[PDB]
């Protein structure tokens, strides 16, 4: 950069902290283990004549 004659100030400015990055983090992972069941029954008493 152009400027004043003789010695000029010696300045670094690279910011240390990480930028935006791929860590979305909040995703569904483990629902509780859950099976549905249709169920059935059939009445079975003595049935003579």
């Amino acid at each position: 950069s152009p400027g004043t004659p003789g010695s000029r100030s010696r300045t670094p400015s690279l910011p240390t902290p990480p930028t935006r990055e791929p860590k979305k983090v909040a995703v569904v992972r483990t629902p509780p283990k859950s099976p549905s069941s249709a169920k059935s029954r059939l009445q079975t008493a003595p049935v003579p004549m």
């Binding site: 902290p17 990480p18 990055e21 983090v25 909040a26 995703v27 569904v28 992972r29 483990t30 629902p31 509780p32 859950s34 099976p35 549905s36």
Partner: protein, 150 residues
């Protein structure tokens, strides 16, 4: 006696531990009235909501300060999905700090691999959703409606 509000979440189970001058019959009547007052909310598919405990010993206090002596007492201990709002608040305060990577030089200094304090965080983000997926209706497949009642 934690800051999260038991009406934001739902109780999943309870235990009620009694001391001193007690009547099982008035404990019955009170629990049953708590199950009646749906202002106190539990999840539907945990029907037997309560564990009960009843001991004879009176309440007991140290002299020279603190609590005054009583003739009957109660302790109440209960799992809730509102614990998730206090853990979500802790974990956001993790993300805010970790997006600059503050503090994580001491954690390396005194031993820790950085992939283990990376894994902790996604495991706690999984915790938010373990606790979210139990705060559900009478459904195991797909099929929920967008109407909410709690």
């Amino acid at each position: 006696m934690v800051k999260c509000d038991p009406r934001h979440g739902k109780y999943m189970a309870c235990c009620l531990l009694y001391r001193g001058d007690v009547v099982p019959k008035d404990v019955n009547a009170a629990i049953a009235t708590i199950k009646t007052k749906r202002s106190i909310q539990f999840v539907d598919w945990c029907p037997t909501g309560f564990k009960v405990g009843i001991n004879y010993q009176p309440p007991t206090v140290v002299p020279g300060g603190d609590l005054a002596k009583v003739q009957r007492a109660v302790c109440m201990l209960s799992n809730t999905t509102a614990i998730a709002e206090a853990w979500a608040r802790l974990d956001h305060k993790f993300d805010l700090m970790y997006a600059k990577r503050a503090f994580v030089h001491w954690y390396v200094g005194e031993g820790m691999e950085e992939g283990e304090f990376s894994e902790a965080r996604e495991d706690m983000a999984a915790l938010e959703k373990d606790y979210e997926e139990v705060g559900v209706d009478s459904v195991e497949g797909e099929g929920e409606e967008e109407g909410e009642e709690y």
